[PDB]
Amino acid sequence: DKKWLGTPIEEMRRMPRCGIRLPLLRPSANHTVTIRVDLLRAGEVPKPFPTHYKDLWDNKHVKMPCSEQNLYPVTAGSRWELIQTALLNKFTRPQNLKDAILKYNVAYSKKWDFTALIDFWDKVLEEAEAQHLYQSILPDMVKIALCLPNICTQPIPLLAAAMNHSITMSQEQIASLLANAFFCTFPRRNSSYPDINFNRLFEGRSSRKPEKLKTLFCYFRRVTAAAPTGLVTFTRQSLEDFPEWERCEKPLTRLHVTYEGTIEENGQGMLQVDFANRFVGGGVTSAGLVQEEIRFLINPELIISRLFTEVLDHNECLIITGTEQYSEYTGYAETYRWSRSHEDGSERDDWQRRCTEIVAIDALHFRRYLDQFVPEKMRRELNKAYCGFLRPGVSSENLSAVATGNWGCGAFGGDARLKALIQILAAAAAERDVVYFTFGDSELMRDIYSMHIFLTERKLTVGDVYKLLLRYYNEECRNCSTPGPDIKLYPFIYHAVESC
Numbered sequence: 453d454k455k456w457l458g459t460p461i462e463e464m465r466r467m468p469r470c471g472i473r474l475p476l477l478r479p480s481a482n483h484t485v486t487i488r489v490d491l492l493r494a495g496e497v498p499k500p501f502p503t504h505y506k507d508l509w510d511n512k513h514v515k516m517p518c519s520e521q522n523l524y525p526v527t528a529g530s531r532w533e534l535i536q537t538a539l540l541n542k543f544t545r546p547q548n549l550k551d552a553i554l555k556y557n558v559a560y561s562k563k564w565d566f567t568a569l570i571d572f573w574d575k576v577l578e579e580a581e582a583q584h585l586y587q588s589i590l591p592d593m594v595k596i597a598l599c600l601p602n603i604c605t606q607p608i609p610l611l612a613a614a615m616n617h618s619i620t621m622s623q624e625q626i627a628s629l630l631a632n633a634f635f636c637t638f639p640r641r642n643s644s645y646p647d648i649n650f651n652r653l654f655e656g657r658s659s660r661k662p663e664k665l666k667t668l669f670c671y672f673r674r675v676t677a678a679a680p681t682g683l684v685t686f687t688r689q690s691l692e693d694f695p696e697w698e699r700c701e702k703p704l705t706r707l708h709v710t711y712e713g714t715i716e717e718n719g720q721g722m723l724q725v726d727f728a729n730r731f732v733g734g735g736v737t738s739a740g741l742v743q744e745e746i747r748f749l750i751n752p753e754l755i756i757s758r759l760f761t762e763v764l765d766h767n768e769c770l771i772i773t774g775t776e777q778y779s780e781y782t783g784y785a786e787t788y789r790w791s792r793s794h795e796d797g798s799e800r801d802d803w804q805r806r807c808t809e810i811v812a813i814d815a816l817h818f819r820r821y822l823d824q825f826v827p828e829k830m831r832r833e834l835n836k837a838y839c840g841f842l843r844p845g846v847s848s849e850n851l852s853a854v855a856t857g858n859w860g861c862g863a864f865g866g867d868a869r870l871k872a873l874i875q876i877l878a879a880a881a882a883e884r885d886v887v888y889f890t891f892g893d894s895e896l897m898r899d900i901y902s903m904h905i906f907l908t909e910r911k912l913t914v915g916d917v918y919k920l921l922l923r924y925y926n927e928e929c930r931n932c933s934t935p936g937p938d939i940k941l942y943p944f945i946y947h948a949v950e951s952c
């Protein structure tokens with residue numbers, strides 16, 4: 453019968469109910485704000501700040517395609533003018549769009565294949581849908597792209613390694629930027645930053661790509677038909693000091709665990725985990741289609757993090773507040789399908805951000821299964837998850853539950869039961885409750901619940917549990933001569949505590 457165990461999800465903290473009173477929104481040395489805060493009003497499109505376009509072309513800011521420094525060989529010409537001339541042409545066939553995009557990407561005319569785009573337009577879409585694409589949706593996308601200098605007036609700093617910095621920008625500004633990424637307009641982006649131009653979406657034979665395309669066009673149709681009115685914050689967070697895990701005296705927090713539901717639907721208002729690549733977004737603009745890529749497609753405002761977010765080091769994460777859901781889907785990887793348009797019902801905070809908080813924390817890839825039991829590797833994951841969960845200067849009463857699942861399992865070779873306990877410990881250290889979705893695995897739900905209530909009823913601390921993990925490594929893994937150990941982790945823990 454039972455679909456969930458533990459503390460009722462109803463009893464877990466959610467935004468906006470649990471939220472702090474936000475301080476007044478204002479630009480500072482660690483907070484770039486690209487709109488007029490004095491004109492920010494519910495239901496109104498934000499006004500860019502500053503009024504006129506200002507340009508920075510350097511190694512600390514986004515290089516905007518509309519910069520006067522974006523040049524091409526003719527003598528130097530303005531590539532932004534070239535871009536306008538190429539994209540301001542009628543499209544009636546997919547070749548026309550390929551040819552347009554290549555005019556200002558000439559070096560790539562033999563490298564970039566547009567097969568997935570051609571197949572999408574010709575062999576996937578209905579003729580009426582193809583007609584709406586080229587008569588309406590693509591021209592509306594060109595227009596919002598070419599409007600970039602009036603929209604995105606303020607230089608956008610890169611979220612570089614080791615920076616603790618926030619960018620708050622309008623959903624409209626994002627739309628402009630992402631329309632540019634679709635048309636592959638971002639200069640010098642074709643090494644420690646993810647891809648942002650969408651050229652790899654158009655390439656290859658793949659049945660994923662039509663579905664990706666449908667998801668993104670669903671977004672593009674919405675935001676070019678009627679401007680979104682809210683804001684989005686992107687915060688790179690980088691911690692210097694990490695807990696001494698073996699000395700940590702904090703108790704475990706509450707747990708709800710279920711084999712039904714999703715982070716995104718059932719974890720509304722909670723800190724939602726993105727099972728990230730260290731290049732945020734992973735394969736979203738290319739071949740990937742699992743948990744991160746899906747989330748970046750149905751909430752495409754996440755994709756713009758790729759424009760400005762340097763690859764995550766071990767002590768870093770990216771926290772994104774206010775992205776909106778535009779699509780629903782079914783399946784994943786080979787069975788992923790775009791279903792329909794989604795009307796996001798989320799409330800907005802006092803900064804006009806959707807009450808949706810997503811954190812990108814990248815797990816390690818374990819080519820050898822036992823490697824993740826090595827203390828250094830356990831600590832690495834604990835500290836990554838901890839950095840992703842901690843909100844310095846906020847009381848625990850005001851922190852939502854963490855909504856997560858089988859982080860780093862799948863292609864990355866994580867043990868689900870180890871990673872569950874890791875996330876439980878990190879959450880406990882950050883003084884947050886845990887809502888854990890096992891994604892159909894009822895046995896995993898029962899196991900995580902059983903271990904959690906076992907440790908809770910015996911009042912073991914974070915440190916107590918971590919020490920038991922070290923004992924597991926020292927007795928069962930270290931001098932282990934086979935691919936897996938003699939005894940599994942949870943049984944080992946039960947026997948070791950029940951032995952005391």
Ligand SMILES: Cn1c2c(c(=S)n(C)c1=O)N[C@H](SCCN1CCOCC1)N2
Nearest residue numbers: 714715742743784857858861862889891
């Ligand atoms: C929406 N969603 C969701 C997943 C999870 S685990 N949860 C909790 C969730 O809410 N996986 C996916 S697709 C990739 C499947 N692999 C399953 C094993 O783990 C790694 C990844 N989508």
